[PDB]
Ligand binder design. Structure first.
Ligand SMILES: Cc1cc2c(cc1C)N(C[C@H](O)[C@H](O)[C@H](O)COP(=O)(O)OP(=O)(O)OC[C@H]1O[C@@H](n3cnc4c(N)ncnc43)[C@H](O)[C@@H]1O)c1[nH]c(=O)[nH]c(=O)c1N2
Ligand SMILES: NC(=O)C1=CN([C@@H]2O[C@H](COP(=O)(O)OP(=O)(O)OC[C@H]3O[C@@H](n4cnc5c(N)ncnc54)[C@H](O)[C@@H]3O)[C@@H](O)[C@H]2O)C=CC1
Ligand code: PRO
Ligand code: PRO
Ligand SMILES: [Mg+2]
Length: 1209
């Protein structure tokens, strides 16, 4: 099959009208507004009349809550009100009323509610919104528990009774019209008698599995029967209808899965529409995320052209006025209504996903947002689109869904004097819009109809996305919020958004406080740009660029300083299809690898002499080149490395980000005194063959070191292209040599006499072999050769019973199986609290079977091949061993076309204990364990016990659990309520501890400092906190008379950055934190008393404990230590028995250092970051031991939108 011949063909040819929609997707905001202002303009007479009507409605609204009266009656604090409603919610989970009342009277009111009632406070963020109007993303469950005890002990049964009755009313009658469709229908008769109509919302969305989509289907079908029976021939305008969400009806509702959507989702909608046709009721397709808009149009088109649905005008469709495509979508819909002769019911809304759209465009590095960023722009867009709809009432049925009295009044007068039922209507939300619309419906008011959008569902169903619904009308910019704010005048509320926009100095300017994705980092650096795989223009352009990349004769050669070298040449094959030859590699002889190091050494002074700013300029130029070449680079990564387009885009972004980040960090730090190490050997893996390749090399180069680049033998072509780009950007050939080949080439480079440093990403075993070889050598200055190694992980995610299953499953499927699990960060062990384990596991297995595995030149492929047949064999041997032990194994079936490549099906293996898993299994293999809540702390121990410490995830809403878990886990990259993959340079600096590597973190501020002989002070690198054991030690030194060492100890205490705690700039809806902690226990190998004191001061000032070499004979130098210091001090004769250590400090002459370095490399377990100094160096240089390498970096990324919305926005 020809590469990319079927990458992403559209569902249908894009008509002129469809293309005008796509063209507007991310149009600059200043370009969208002027035509909207013009279309929204009305006569001065109309504007005055509309302001009068709006003032009249608002005066009525203000002239006429339950939770607030309850808070007042019992003098509750906010936390008490929230805690009370959480208790009421839990009591309502008890089905029998008499049982519940007995528990309240006999057990709850009397004392400890904790012994009788899953945290009570799982939904406290929602109840917090109800009580306070403010959204907090996580729940302070200890504060709520205290508040609940306090209020119960103060007020007793009466307050509990009142809370229960209040929650019962709100959850049964306010947030929903009824629990079931029959109950909702019964409660609809009252307002139907007043002139209202209804559209029922069954509260389904985001199917994760086929079974869940089928459940949502049968729920919609049963509701259509009930609504149609009740409609009883009233028709689509007077009678009730239904609203559906396409995401409820298929678990893979996305553009990437468009073929499955048209084949599998479309027939389901058609079947529901046929039933709606027979009863003659409305069936409305709700609008969802911006990347689903254009896909949904293909379903609308097919349905409106399907003759089986003819004769029925009930098909409806929502368009969101906050979207830049809205008027063009309306043009398309009106034309479709004309062609089909179906009077499409068009619900105009403003839009419910605003904060999520802002976050998504920022995360994806896209050109602009697909929605407006000023609320007034959405208001003008709405009015302009209403004008378009009101001119087409013969062709469509406009439905103006809004609670904004000003918007309503403007449209009411825009529509003019003539009205008949069926011309158009208004719409509102149940339990929210009735106060406004009771001033609209009826001959005594404005005599215009209103359809009530009526949620229907149980308590569990309505709570799932209640936060997003509350924010529709609850944000500070929301009309319903502002009308209830006394500080907001009626004049402010009736302000005409059209005229306000028209008079702004720059019409349609972007919000001042929302950064475009490119500007996320401000003046520090330019964000890399992504590509929108939902944009048909992008998919069409990418299709051609990808095909063109597959026709190129890609090569990789040994590129020595003197020119390309001869060698053994072989082809490079696509891992997804070995018949697809991607290019040819000429591999490096061991002789030429040694020669390359000599040439690098000869060239080292000339590269070091290029000033740091100019070296950084080379990196910035290379980043521009990679950005411009992204589509071609994507094609090569897809075919050579077996990656999906989505992952290839992110990888090229990461490479660009490394180049720009290290360039900026260089401009912030490097001066004449930060001399280069010399030739650095950069050994890189096949799983991030551009990004990690580029990151290591760029850092070494910009620090002033010439580089020998040894790429993974599986992925030399993208590496050769990366070197070509860096050379084009100005890196001299003598500064950057490419040495393709296998481990023998890597080993020859490591062992070469002039090698001054090694940067390695790959296996622990190979890093250990490199460490053993480097320990044989010292630099010309008699110091160890630095090794930076990142070596993978055994990464866990802990999920408690407060987490949202659908969120968990999505993050798990992505974290475990993205890139076929070939990320070092991939989720390996999912840990499920016992009470939710079976439900989440069922959902996870169902989601597993929705993944498409195959050759990655198709947008529809989710999981590609593993890199080699040997990798495949190793992974499969692990799976079969687990199966042979009787562990439950779930696997997706592989298509026959996978046989030409090396594929492993995504797999779920259920384990009894974490210790059942003994080694990192570098493939799409998720292990699942269950835990009881009281065993959480033991579980964290179990996770730490593997010895790894790279990525870690936690899904919980509860602050106590966040605090506990994050304080006890020992990993470098933590992720809360999100996936654990795709660390962003400079936002989640990436790297771990233990068996996961040495540090410092790539994409972090300590990285460049390891690549120079004297480390600079990184930006923001300081701490006002002083370690108290360090202070006790300095006092002990003064008491012993060691006044010089006591001063040095105090200086180390101040110099240490232990306790640094920063928030890094990044996308909205996330908090990204970076902190410096102690490393652990540092091995001290002193030679003199003063050396031991200096070593102890360095280690204690950075928060560490120590093990001191008993063979030093210096035990008598540490007599009568304070207990606080003694607690941190042990003496070690057998270093291997007393580990693991987290670093080492060595004192001695060159031969002593070499001997100790060899002994240290022989210690089992983690590679130790070793620092050595002579006694004279300790006396001359206060920084003989650099404190940068005695702290541990920790990155934590918290998804603050996880509760369903973004409070900050
Ligand atoms: C009957 C019915 C049916 C639906 C919906 C509402 C109603 C009444 N909604 C929700 C709707 O889109 C909207 O979020 C709420 O109705 C509130 O908007 P109003 O016009 O009431 O108020 P209001 O006039 O106060 O407008 C609030 C809206 O302004 C927008 N906004 C806020 N800040 C902004 C900013 N900084 N920049 C740009 N825009 C900003 C948002 O769209 C926000 O919801 C919806 N929504 C949806 O996406 N799909 C759907 O299928 C439905 N269905
Ligand atoms: N941390 C990560 O991101 C990576 C970790 N791994 C782990 O390693 C396992 C094996 O995969 P491999 O590709 O075998 O990784 P590997 O670690 O053997 O290869 C990594 C790099 O080291 C080079 N290399 C191999 N032996 C060497 C030696 N003796 N001296 C110097 N350089 C040497 C290779 O050529 C490649 O460039 C994987 O299954 C996975 O567990 C591998 C690749 C990525
Ligand atoms: O599309 C057309 O040409 C005809 C006109 C009326 C409805 N269909
Ligand atoms: O976090 C991730 O998924 C990638 C893997 C290497 C570093 N960044
Ligand atoms: Mg290998």
């Amino acid at each position: 099959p020809a590469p990319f011949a079927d990458f992403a063909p559209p569902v249908r040819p894009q008509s002129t009208l469809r293309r005008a929609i796509t063209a507007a997707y991310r149009r600059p905001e200043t370009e969208c507004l002027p035509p909207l202002v013009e279309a929204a303009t009305q006569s001065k007479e109309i504007r005055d009349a509309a302001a009068s009507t709006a003032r009249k409605l608002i005066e009525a609204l203000r002239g006429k809550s339950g939770v607030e009266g309850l808070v007042q009656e019992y003098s509750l604090s906010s936390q008490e009100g929230v805690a009370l409603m959480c208790l009421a919610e839990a009591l309502l989970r008890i089905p029998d009323t008499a049982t519940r009342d007995a528990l309240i009277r006999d057990k709850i009111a009397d004392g400890n509610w904790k012994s009788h009632l899953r945290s009570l406070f799982v939904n406290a963020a929602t109840w917090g919104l109800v009580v306070t109007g403010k959204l907090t993303s996580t729940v302070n469950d200890r504060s709520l528990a205290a508040a609940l005890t306090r209020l119960i002990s103060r007020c007793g049964e009466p307050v509990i009774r009142r809370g229960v009755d209040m929650a019962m009313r709100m959850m049964g009658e306010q947030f929903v019209t009824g629990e079931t469709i029959r109950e909702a229908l019964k409660r609809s008769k009252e307002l139907e008698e007043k002139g209202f109509s209804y559209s029922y919302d069954m509260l389904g969305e985001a199917a994760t599995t086929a079974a869940d989509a089928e459940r949502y289907y049968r729920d919609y079908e049963s509701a259509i029967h009930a609504i149609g029976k009740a409609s009883a021939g009233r028709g689509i305008y007077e009678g009730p209808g239904i609203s559906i969400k396409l995401s409820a009806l298929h678990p893979r509702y996305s553009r990437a899965q468009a073929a499955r959507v048209m084949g599998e989702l479309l027939p389901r909608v058609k079947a529901l529409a046929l039933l709606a046709k027979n009863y003659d009721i409305g069936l409305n397709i709700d609008a969802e995320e911006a990347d689903r808009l254009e896909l949904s149009l293909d379903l609308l088109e097919v349905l409106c052209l399907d003759g089986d649905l003819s004769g029925w005008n009930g098909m409806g469709f929502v368009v969101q006025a906050y979207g830049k495509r809205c008027p063009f979508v309306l043009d398309f819909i009106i034309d479709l209504a004309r062609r089909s002769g179906r009077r499409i019911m068009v619900r105009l809304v403003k839009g419910a996903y605003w904060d999520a759209e802002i976050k998504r465009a920022q995360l994806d590095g896209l050109a602009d947002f697909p929605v407006f960023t000023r609320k007034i722009h959405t208001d003008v867009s709405y009015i302009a689109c209403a004008a378009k709809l009101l001119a087409a009432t013969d062709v469509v049925f406009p439905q103006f869904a809004t609670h904004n009295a000003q918007t309503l009044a403007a449209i009411y007068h825009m529509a003019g004097k003539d009205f008949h039922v069926g011309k158009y209507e208004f719409q509102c939300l149940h339990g929210m819009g009735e106060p406004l619309y009771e001033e609209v419906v009826g001959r005594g008011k404005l005599d215009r109809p209103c359809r009530i959008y009526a949620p229907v569902g149980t308590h569990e169903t309505l709570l799932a996305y209640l936060v997003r619904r509350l924010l529709e009308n609850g944000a500070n910019s929301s009309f319903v919020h502002r009308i209830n704010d006394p500080k907001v005048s009626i004049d402010e509320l009736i302000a005409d958004p059209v005229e306000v926009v028209r008079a702004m100095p720059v019409v349609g300017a972007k919000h001042d406080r929302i950064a475009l994705p490119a500007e996320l980092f401000g003046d520090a650096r330019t964000n890399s740009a992504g590509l929108d795989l939902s944009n048909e223009e992008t998919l069409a352009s990418l299709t051609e660029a990808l095909r063109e990349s597959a026709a190129m004769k890609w090569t990789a050669l040994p590129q020595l300083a003197t020119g390309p070298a001869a060698g053994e040449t072989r082809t490079v094959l696509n891992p997804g299809d070995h018949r697809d030859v991607v290019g040819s590699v000429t591999e490096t002889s061991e002789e030429d690898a040694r020669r390359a190091v000599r040439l690098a050494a000869d060239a080292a002074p000339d590269w070091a002499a290029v000033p740091p700013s100019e070296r950084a300029a080379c990196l910035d130029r290379a980043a521009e080149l990679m950005q411009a070449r992204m589509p071609t680079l994507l094609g090569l990564i897809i075919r050579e490395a077996g990656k999906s387009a989505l992952n290839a885009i992110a990888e090229v972004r990461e490479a660009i980000d490394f180049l720009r980040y290290y360039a900026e960090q260089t401009r912030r730090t490097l001066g004449p005194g930060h001399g280069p190490l010399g030739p650095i050997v950069c050994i890189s893996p096949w799983n991030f063959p551009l990004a990690i390749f580029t990151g290591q090399i760029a850092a070494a180069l910009v620090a002033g070191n010439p580089v020998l680049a040894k790429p993974a033998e599986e992925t030399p072509l993208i590496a050769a292209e990366g070197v070509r780009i860096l050379r084009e950007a100005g890196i001299p050939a003598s500064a950057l040599q490419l040495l393709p080949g296998d481990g023998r080439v890597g080993a020859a480079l490591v062992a070469a006499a002039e090698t001054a440093g090694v940067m390695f990403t790959g296996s622990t075993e190979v890093a250990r072999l490199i460490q053993a070889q480097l320990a044989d050598r010292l630099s010309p200055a008699g110091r160890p050769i630095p090794l930076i190694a990142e070596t993978g992980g055994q990464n866990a995610m802990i999920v408690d019973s407060s987490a949202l299953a659908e969120q968990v499953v999505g993050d798990v499927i992505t974290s475990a199986f993205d890139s076929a699990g070939q990320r070092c960060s991939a989720l390996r062990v999912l840990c499920l609290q016992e009470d939710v384990a079976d439900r989440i596991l069922t959902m996870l297995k169902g989601a597993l079977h929705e993944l498409h595995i195959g050759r990655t030149d198709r947008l529809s492929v989710d999981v590609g091949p593993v890199i080699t047949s040997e990798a495949k064999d190793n992974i499969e041997k692990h799976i079969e061993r687990m199966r042979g032990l009787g562990r439950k194994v779930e696997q997706i079936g592989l298509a026959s076309e996978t046989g030409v490549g090396t594929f492993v099906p995504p797999t779920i293996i259920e384990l009894e204990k974490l210790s059942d898993l003994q080694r990192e299994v570098f493939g799409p293999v998720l292990h699942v364990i269950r835990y009881r809540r009281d065993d959480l702390d033991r579980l964290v121990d179990d996770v730490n016990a593997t010895g790894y410490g790279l990525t870690f995830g936690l899904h919980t809403r509860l602050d106590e659990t966040i605090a506990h878990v994050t304080s006890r886990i020992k990993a470098g990259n933590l992720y809360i309520n999100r996936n654990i993959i795709g660390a962003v340079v400079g936002v989640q600096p990436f790297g771990g501890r233990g068996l996961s590597g040495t540090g410092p973190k790539a994409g972090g501020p300590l990285y460049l400092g390891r690549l120079v002989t004297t480390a600079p002070v990184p930006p923001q690198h300081s701490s006002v906190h002083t370690d108290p054991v360090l202070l006790d030690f300095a006092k002990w030194l003064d008491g012993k008379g060691a006044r010089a060492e006591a001063e040095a100890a105090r200086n180390a205490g101040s110099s240490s950055a232990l306790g640094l705690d920063l928030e890094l700039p990044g996308p909205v809806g996330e908090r990204n934190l970076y902190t410096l902690h102690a490393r652990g226990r540092i091995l001290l190998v002193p030679a003199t008393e003063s050396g031991l004191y200096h070593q102890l001061a360095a280690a204690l000032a950075t928060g560490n404990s120590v093990a001191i070499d008993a063979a030093s004979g210096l035990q008598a130098s540490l007599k009568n230590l304070p207990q606080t210091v003694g607690l941190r001090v042990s003496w070690s004769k057998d270093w291997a028995a007393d580990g693991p250590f987290a670093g080492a400090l060595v004192e001695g002459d060159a031969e002593r250092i070499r001997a100790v370095n060899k002994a240290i490399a022989a210690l089992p377990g983690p590679l130790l970051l070793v620092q050595a100094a002579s006694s004279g160096e300790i006396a001359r240089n206060p920084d003989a031991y650099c404190l940068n390498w005695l702290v541990e970096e920790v990155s934590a990324s918290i998804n603050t939108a996880a509760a369903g919305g973004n409070a900050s926005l």
